[PDB]
Design an enzyme around this catalytic site. Structure first.
Site, short mmCIF file in Angstrom:
data_model
loop_
_atom_site.label_atom_id
_atom_site.label_comp_id
_atom_site.label_asym_id
_atom_site.label_seq_id
_atom_site.Cartn_x
_atom_site.Cartn_y
_atom_site.Cartn_z
N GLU A 12 0.83 -1.19 0.00
CA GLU A 12 0.00 0.00 0.00
C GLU A 12 0.87 1.26 0.00
O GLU A 12 1.28 1.75 1.06
CB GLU A 12 -0.93 -0.04 1.22
N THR A 14 1.99 5.35 -1.11
CA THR A 14 1.50 6.64 -0.62
C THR A 14 0.42 7.23 -1.51
O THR A 14 -0.01 8.37 -1.32
CB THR A 14 2.65 7.67 -0.50
N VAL A 17 -3.45 1.31 -3.04
CA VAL A 17 -3.06 -0.09 -2.99
C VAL A 17 -2.35 -0.50 -4.28
O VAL A 17 -2.68 -0.02 -5.36
CB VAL A 17 -4.30 -0.98 -2.77
N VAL A 18 -1.36 -1.38 -4.14
CA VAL A 18 -0.60 -1.87 -5.29
C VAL A 18 -0.74 -3.38 -5.35
O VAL A 18 -0.58 -4.06 -4.34
CB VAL A 18 0.89 -1.53 -5.20
N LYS A 33 -1.26 -0.14 -9.79
CA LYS A 33 -1.47 0.80 -8.71
C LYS A 33 -2.80 1.52 -8.91
O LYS A 33 -3.04 2.14 -9.95
CB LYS A 33 -0.32 1.81 -8.69
N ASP A 82 12.38 -4.55 -3.50
CA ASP A 82 12.77 -3.14 -3.38
C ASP A 82 14.06 -3.07 -2.57
O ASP A 82 14.45 -4.06 -1.94
CB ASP A 82 11.66 -2.28 -2.76
N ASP A 123 10.12 12.36 -4.12
CA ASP A 123 9.89 11.51 -2.96
C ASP A 123 10.69 10.20 -3.00
O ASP A 123 10.16 9.14 -2.70
CB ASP A 123 8.39 11.23 -2.83
N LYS A 125 12.99 7.16 -1.96
CA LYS A 125 13.19 6.42 -0.72
C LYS A 125 13.49 4.99 -1.12
O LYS A 125 13.17 4.58 -2.24
CB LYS A 125 11.94 6.48 0.17
N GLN A 127 12.12 2.23 -0.56
CA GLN A 127 11.00 1.45 -1.05
C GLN A 127 10.61 1.72 -2.50
O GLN A 127 9.91 0.90 -3.08
CB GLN A 127 9.78 1.58 -0.12
N1 LIG Z 1 6.71 -2.08 -9.92
C1 LIG Z 1 6.75 -2.97 -8.87
O1 LIG Z 1 7.02 -4.13 -9.10
C2 LIG Z 1 6.51 -2.53 -7.59
C3 LIG Z 1 5.62 -1.43 -7.41
C4 LIG Z 1 5.32 -0.91 -6.11
N2 LIG Z 1 4.52 0.09 -5.98
O2 LIG Z 1 4.24 0.58 -4.78
O3 LIG Z 1 3.94 0.65 -7.04
C5 LIG Z 1 5.93 -1.50 -4.97
C6 LIG Z 1 6.82 -2.60 -5.12
C7 LIG Z 1 7.12 -3.14 -6.43
N3 LIG Z 1 7.94 -4.15 -6.58
C8 LIG Z 1 8.77 -4.74 -5.48
C9 LIG Z 1 7.98 -5.79 -4.73
C10 LIG Z 1 7.46 -6.93 -5.41
C11 LIG Z 1 6.70 -7.90 -4.70
C12 LIG Z 1 6.47 -7.73 -3.30
O4 LIG Z 1 5.75 -8.66 -2.63
C13 LIG Z 1 6.99 -6.59 -2.62
C14 LIG Z 1 7.74 -5.62 -3.33
#
Ligand SMILES: NC(=O)c1cc([N+](=O)[O-])ccc1NCc1ccc(O)cc1
EC number: 2.7.11.22
Length: 294
Positions: A12, A14, A17-18, A33, A82, A123, A125, A127
Site C-alpha cells: 500500500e 503513498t 493499494v498496489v 497501482k 525493493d 519523494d 526512498k 521502497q
Molecule cells: N513495480 C513494482 O514491481 C513494484 C511497485 C510498487 N509500488 O508501490 O507501485 C511496490 C513494489 C514493487 N515491486 C517490489 C515488490 C514486489 C513484490 C512484493 O511482494 C513486494 C515488493
C-alpha cells in the site's frame, strides 16, 4: 479489473493499494497501482500520460494509464524486490561496496535522464528503488508527485516518511528543483553504507534538527538566502557541523567526497546527477550481481 487476475497485494503505497497482476490476455505480469478520489483532474491525467514516454533502463516503465469510474490505475513493469527489503536482508554483513557503487551509479544515470527531461521524483526512498536478479536497480514513481500532490499522510492513515526530504522542502520552499532528488539519493547512499538511516526524523522539525545536528545549522555563509526562507526561524539552535569521517565510516575519501557534494545545503551548490557520474568514486565501478532470495 477483469483484465487482470490479482496475484497478490504488493502493498500500500503513498497513493493507493498496489497489486501484482497478470494480464489475462498477454500473460504479462505487472504492478497495478490504484490511485486514490471523486473525478480525477484532467491536468493530472495529461501529466501522467506524458510519463509513458519517459523510458530508460534505470526507470521503472509506466506501461499504461487507465482512467475509469473516478478510479485511476497505473500499470508498471514488475520487479521482484525493493531496496528497503534488500538492505534489511543484507543488514548482518552489509551490501558489498562494489554493489553499493553499482547501484548508486545506475540511480544517478536514471536521475540524469529524468532531470534532462525536466522530470523530478521529489519523494525518493528505499521502497521505491526496485532491483532484479540481473544487478539492475530502477527508480519507481518518477513524476507522480508533481502530476498529483501530497497530503498529510499517504491517503489513509499512513505516516509519510520524511527521512529523505531535502532541507529546502523542510524550510517551506515552494519551488523544488532537481537538487531535492540528489539530496534524497545521498541519504540513501549513506544508509546503504552504514546500514542505518542517516536522518530518521519522526516529525518535520525533528527531521530538520537531525540534519542540523549532523551538517551544522545552516547560515547565510554556506546557504545564501536561507534565513529568508518561509519556515526558517531565527530561534533555531546553532549546532556545529560534524566530521564526515564520523558520519559514514568506514567509507573511503572518494565516497565521502561525493556524499558531501550530494548533501550541500545550498540546492545550487549541490552536485547534479550528470556531474556526480564523473566523480572519481566511480573510477572503478562495475556491475555485480546481488544474491537475491525471492
Ligand atoms: N513495480 C513494482 O514491481 C513494484 C511497485 C510498487 N509500488 O508501490 O507501485 C511496490 C513494489 C514493487 N515491486 C517490489 C515488490 C514486489 C513484490 C512484493 O511482494 C513486494 C515488493
Amino acid at each position: 479489473m477483469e483484465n487482470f487476475q490479482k496475484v497478490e497485494k504488493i502493498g500500500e503505497g503513498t497513493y493507493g493499494v498496489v497489486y501484482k497482476a497478470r494480464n489475462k490476455l498477454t500473460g504479462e505480469v505487472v504492478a497495478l497501482k490504484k490511485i486514490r478520489t471523486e473525478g480525477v483532474p484532467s491536468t493530472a491525467i495529461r501529466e501522467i500520460s506524458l510519463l509513458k514516454e519517459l523510458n530508460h533502463p534505470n526507470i521503472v516503465k509506466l506501461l499504461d494509464v487507465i482512467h475509469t469510474e473516478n478510479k485511476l490505475y497505473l500499470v508498471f513493469e514488475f520487479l521482484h524486490q525493493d531496496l528497503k527489503k534488500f538492505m534489511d536482508a543484507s543488514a548482518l554483513t552489509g551490501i558489498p561496496l562494489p554493489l553499493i557503487k553499482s547501484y548508486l551509479f545506475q540511480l544517478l544515470q536514471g536521475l540524469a535522464f529524468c532531470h534532462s527531461h525536466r522530470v523530478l521524483h521529489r519523494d525518493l526512498k528505499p521502497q521505491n528503488l526496485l532491483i532484479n536478479t540481473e544487478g539492475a536497480i530502477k527508480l519507481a514513481d518518477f513524476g507522480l508527485a508533481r502530476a498529483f500532490g501530497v497530503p498529510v499522510r499517504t491517503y489513509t492513515h499512513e505516516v509519510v516518511t520524511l527521512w529523505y526530504r531535502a532541507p529546502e522542502i523542510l524550510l517551506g520552499c515552494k519551488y523544488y528543483s532537481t537538487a531535492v532528488d540528489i539530496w534524497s539519493l545521498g541519504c540513501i547512499f549513506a544508509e546503504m553504507v552504514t546500514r542505518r538511516a542517516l536522518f530518521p526524523g519522526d516529525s518535520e522539525i525533528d527531521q530538520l534538527f537531525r540534519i542540523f545536528r549532523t551538517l551544522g545549522t545552516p547560515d547565510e555563509v554556506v546557504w545564501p538566502g536561507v534565513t529568508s526562507m518561509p519556515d526558517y526561524k531565527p530561534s533555531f539552535p546553532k549546532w556545529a557541523r560534524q566530521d564526515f569521517s564520523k558520519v559514514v565510516p568506514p567509507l573511503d575519501e572518494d565516497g565521502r567526497s561525493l556524499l558531501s557534494q550530494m548533501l550541500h545545503y545550498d540546492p545550487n551548490k549541490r552536485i547534479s546527477a550528470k556531474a556526480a557520474l564523473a566523480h572519481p568514486f566511480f573510477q572503478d565501478v562495475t556491475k555485480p550481481v546481488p544474491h537475491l532470495r525471492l
